């Protein structure tokens, strides 16, 4: 087996929430994770063929003052093609968080351990493990940048030469 | 004892200097000031290439000796800013002293790479080279410098901030000589 | 670990020879082995600091009709410093082959294993293995159209996220 | 120990066989495997006095077109001293090869692995392990660029710092 | 491992103080230590591309009248970049000795084990193990005539075809 | 853990550096040429007040220092001269920095004196304070130097004299500081 294991933490995502438009339910974060999403990930998976997530860990930083107002619900949709984005569907799922907008958090999901495809595809469960959401819970009162990290570890396979 | 016509050198000592010394300490490898408003995403805060001149003890102790181990080396990034300063930062040490790439994804690749909010404190525990080190300087500083620390903004701060780049460093200095600059 | 093995096979370079124009002694090949001379360990060398060669064979595949005449001298310089593009200085290295253009062959270099950095710097034997010759032998009587391939396996290690 | 042990591969001839001159029996290669026909076993056999020849080996590479008539003879006589330059004479020795002059050949010889002086002196059997000798076989029809190689193994005793 | 080990004592360095222009921190002998430098090591490294020095000596033999005055200081710099000529810089290194110039001394200096190059680059510090200076202490009565010679071993390794 | 007003601060090891370092060398604190016949009797060949800056290593050694103690001290005088010459000199260390008597009678009363000709080395084993020493400069120099080595001629040299003084010197620092000039 020439498969090579890649670890690292890398950000997902940046999202710079203006105060007074994060009302409840707004989608701040929406990323259905893909090793192009992530950086390194991004050229591991440009040198090759199917990964197989191993380690995958979400950690919200989120940056502002520990005056400010509301909060947020994050959740890792184990399925790539769902596509409702609310507080029930994220409430449902295990791992997900909630928390004021000062607060760090970890989501610790529950995803596929198949090995998938870094390419595009037809069908998407065959390329992702899912999606993360973050939504705001209430309405914020200051000025929010929240960035969403993730400690990943992927084993990778099939050598080749992909383009974006 | 008959009367020679030259009688030999009686140095002995000679060139017998101490050879190995171990040093530890911490200094302030950096400090920034950043008014409301500049801070903006990728802002390069801190931009730091670890050398023995970098740490001023460490300097003068380099200036006698010509190798340098790096045998521990950790930082703190210490941010003197209340609570209510919205904004962040990215901070890792680069094991390149060479590479100036000065973004969050070269920051965070790098192992013990830390993203914090303004107001809190992190120790970045980096992945540094354990070889020998040239003390002086060369025409290529990847023999002289184990790399260098980089501190970005993650977001834009609201607030005044104020931040202290602090190293802890130990190193085993050997090859004794004298340089000069 | 940090420590990932990489292999593969890629074509270093591509070379096209007009007829009568391949002198004894003129240069058709003249490549500094570095990471972004290859695809694939271009990308690996992107998301790592310090590589080591493992194993290096090149394959020169001359793709000219069997009644061209002349030939060529293939060889590997271990030292990327060195100069030197003469007949004797390509011979000495260890591997170096001999062939007639209508006849592909294989270089087994020898070179010493020592970790090097993916990213450039000041001295280049910090960062490349070394270099691939190869000259003409004779004068060519036809167009020989030249593909200088690298059949390599490298150790990657300090995981980082460098820019061209 | 004095004796260091090395190994190379290097060209003792190159030749040039211009069409229609190369009848049969023609002398082609006539060369006297001395130390400094072989440049880096030249450098060598100058920081010493005494050489033996663990292993040789000739590699013929004539470099014509395919539709190149006639052939050659190759053969390595083990004596320095003997001036006999007729088929016969080559084909009795070990190793000899008959080959058509677009086809690559191997000479294995066989010879007494006597220490050897690599300086110059009056009796040539102490110099020097023998003579290649490459002879045409029929005629020739194109132009043959004709390279001769020796991957040789050699062990050196004695040092000193010797002139040309 | 195909690593040639070589060694001998050779002469470093030549050099005719004339009497009265010994003046106190003259430079009488400065050399950056290469195996260029060394007459079998010159052709040794010409033969070979690294070597590793195991073990260096320096025997300063001044050949002069006994009833002569002044004396010399010798020391090996261990960095070839240093450009430090002094007797500070000298008597701060180990293995410096200081003597008569009738008296005959060994210097045994602290020099790199590591694998260095026999060219030359745009580092010196991967080229060589360092320099030794021999400086005056005093002034001399009469002509000094001063040969600094070396006791060195190597090991060589990566062949190759070096020039000057 | 309740968003406070303000964190406390997290700086841990702060004021914790190294407070004792060894070092020895050996160093040539004075080097004298006499050309024929000036090197009357009394004259002062040598005068160096043995302090960390005239010691190079240990200067830069005690910049980051504050106080020093001499554990080991000795001289050497080494004339590189032929034994032709006429002449000879007398070597003391007077363990006062302040005293500036030079005299062969002031040099002799001292412990460890040497009297030698021209063409004789000599070791001076000295008297010296065990006490601790400052790095700095003060007012009064009995609290930073533990004294000075004095070298003067006997008699007249006939020939040119080269004299090289030299010093082994041992030395424990304690106090770290930062000092400046
Ligand atoms: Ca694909
Ligand atoms: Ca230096
Ligand atoms: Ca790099
Ligand atoms: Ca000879
Ligand atoms: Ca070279
Ligand atoms: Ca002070």
Redesign the interface.
């Given at each position: 087996t020439?498969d090579?294991?890649?670890s690292?933490?890398?950000?997902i995502s940046?999202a710079?929430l203006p105060a007074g438009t994060g009302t409840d339910g707004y989608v701040v974060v929406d990323a259905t994770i893909v090793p192009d999403l992530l950086?390194?990930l991004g050229?591991?998976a440009?040198?090759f063929q199917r990964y197989a997530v191993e380690t995958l860990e979400f950690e919200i930083?989120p940056?502002?003052?520990?005056?400010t107002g509301g909060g947020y619900v994050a959740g890792f949709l184990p399925d790539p093609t769902d596509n409702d984005h609310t507080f029930d569907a994220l409430q449902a799922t295990r791992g997900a968080v909630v928390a004021k907008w000062?607060e760090?958090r970890t989501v610790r999901p529950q995803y596929t351990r198949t090995l998938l495809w870094t390419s595009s595809g037809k069908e998407q469960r065959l390329t992702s493990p899912g999606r993360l959401i973050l939504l705001c819970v209430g309405n914020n009162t200051?000025?929010?940048?929240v960035?969403v990290?993730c400690r990943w570890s992927v084993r990778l396979s099939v050598?080749?030469?992909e383009t974006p």
């Open positions: 020439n090579v294991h890649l690292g933490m890398s950000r940046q710079v950086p390194r050229h591991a440009r040198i930083q940056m502002c003052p520990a005056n000062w760090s200051d000025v929010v940048n960035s990290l050598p080749s030469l």
